[PDB]
Amino acid sequence: HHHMVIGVTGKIGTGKSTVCEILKNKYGAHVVNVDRIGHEVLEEVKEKLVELFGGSVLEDGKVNRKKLAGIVFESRENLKKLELLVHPLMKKRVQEIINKTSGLIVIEAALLKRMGLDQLCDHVITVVASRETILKRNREADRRLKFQEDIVPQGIVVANNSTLEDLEKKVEEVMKLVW
Numbered sequence: 705h706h707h708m709v710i711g712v713t714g715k716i717g718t719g720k721s722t723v724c725e726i727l728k729n730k731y732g733a734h735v736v737n738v739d740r741i742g743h744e745v746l747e748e749v750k751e752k753l754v755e756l757f758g759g760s761v762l763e764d765g766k767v768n769r770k771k772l773a774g775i776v777f778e779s780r781e782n783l784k785k786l787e788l789l790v791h792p793l794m795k796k797r798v799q800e801i802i803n804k805t806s807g808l809i810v811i812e813a814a815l816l817k818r819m820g821l822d823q824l825c826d827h828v829i830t831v832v833a834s835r836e837t838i839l840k841r842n843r844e845a846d847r848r849l850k851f852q853e854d855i856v857p858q859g860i861v862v863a864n865n866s867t868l869e870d871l872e873k874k875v876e877e878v879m880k881l882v883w
């Protein structure tokens with residue numbers, strides 16, 4: 705399993721998904737959506753969540769991300785408790801995909817550095833964009849940005865403050881460098 709791993713990080717609404725879609729569609733990347741892997745992990749730790757945050761994190765007998773987000777994004781203390789529970793398992797799961805996968809692998813994660821995933825990467829792209837731009841694009845951003853102050857530019861910075869065609873040109877220039 706010969707492969708190259710490129711991390712794609714950046715704050716919410718900056719353009720990670722969009723960059724990753726381009727890498728997938730034009731360059732053949734296998735995209736590891738670290739958010740989705742989080743969702744799968746949540747289901748695996750239902751009992752511990754209930755132990756941490758009460759039955760309300762649930763809808764019926766069921767983990768509900770809207771209710772959980774309501775809790776964890778009101779407090780750094782709460783968010784840390786969740787991160788301590790799910791990050792180790794998500795890391796293990798990322799590593800496992802990397803090991804089983806050949807070719808170009810893209811690790812899409814806002815929290816690339818916080819989770820130590822950047823150390824799995826051969827190169828890192830950080831997507832950046834102005835606050836005003838982020839707020840026009842994503843409605844959770846006002847609330848979640850407050851918990852992303854440690855997501856600072858690393859590796860190759862790709863500014864996404866104009867058009868999609870312009871973003872496509874920049875992604876192509878980066879791939880010319882590293883691929």
Ligand SMILES: CC(C)(COP(=O)(O)OP(=O)(O)OC[C@@H]1O[C@@H](n2cnc3c(N)ncnc32)[C@H](O)[C@@H]1O)[C@H](O)C(=O)NCCC(=O)NCCS
Pocket residue numbers: 715716717738739740742743746769770772773776783786787790812813814815816848851852
């Ligand atoms: C509170 C949860 C349930 C909210 O889930 P929800 O489906 O509403 O959104 P989802 O997490 O899929 O994605 C939007 C996200 O908001 C932001 N976000 C998610 N987790 C975090 C976090 N721990 N800190 C800061 N921002 C976060 C990110 O930019 C991310 O793209 C959260 O996603 C969660 O399951 N635990 C956080 C685990 C984690 O660190 N996930 C992100 C990995 S990059």
Ligand SMILES: Nc1ncnc2c1ncn2[C@@H]1O[C@H](COP(=O)(O)OP(=O)(O)O)[C@@H](O)[C@H]1O
Pocket residue numbers: 714715716717718719720721722723831841842864865866867868871
């Ligand atoms: N250059 C752009 N122009 C207009 N809209 C954009 C641009 N880049 C991204 N978007 C839009 O902004 C939203 C957030 O993009 P996304 O790529 O999901 O950010 P992230 O994945 O970093 O959280 C998406 O709905 C996308 O369609």
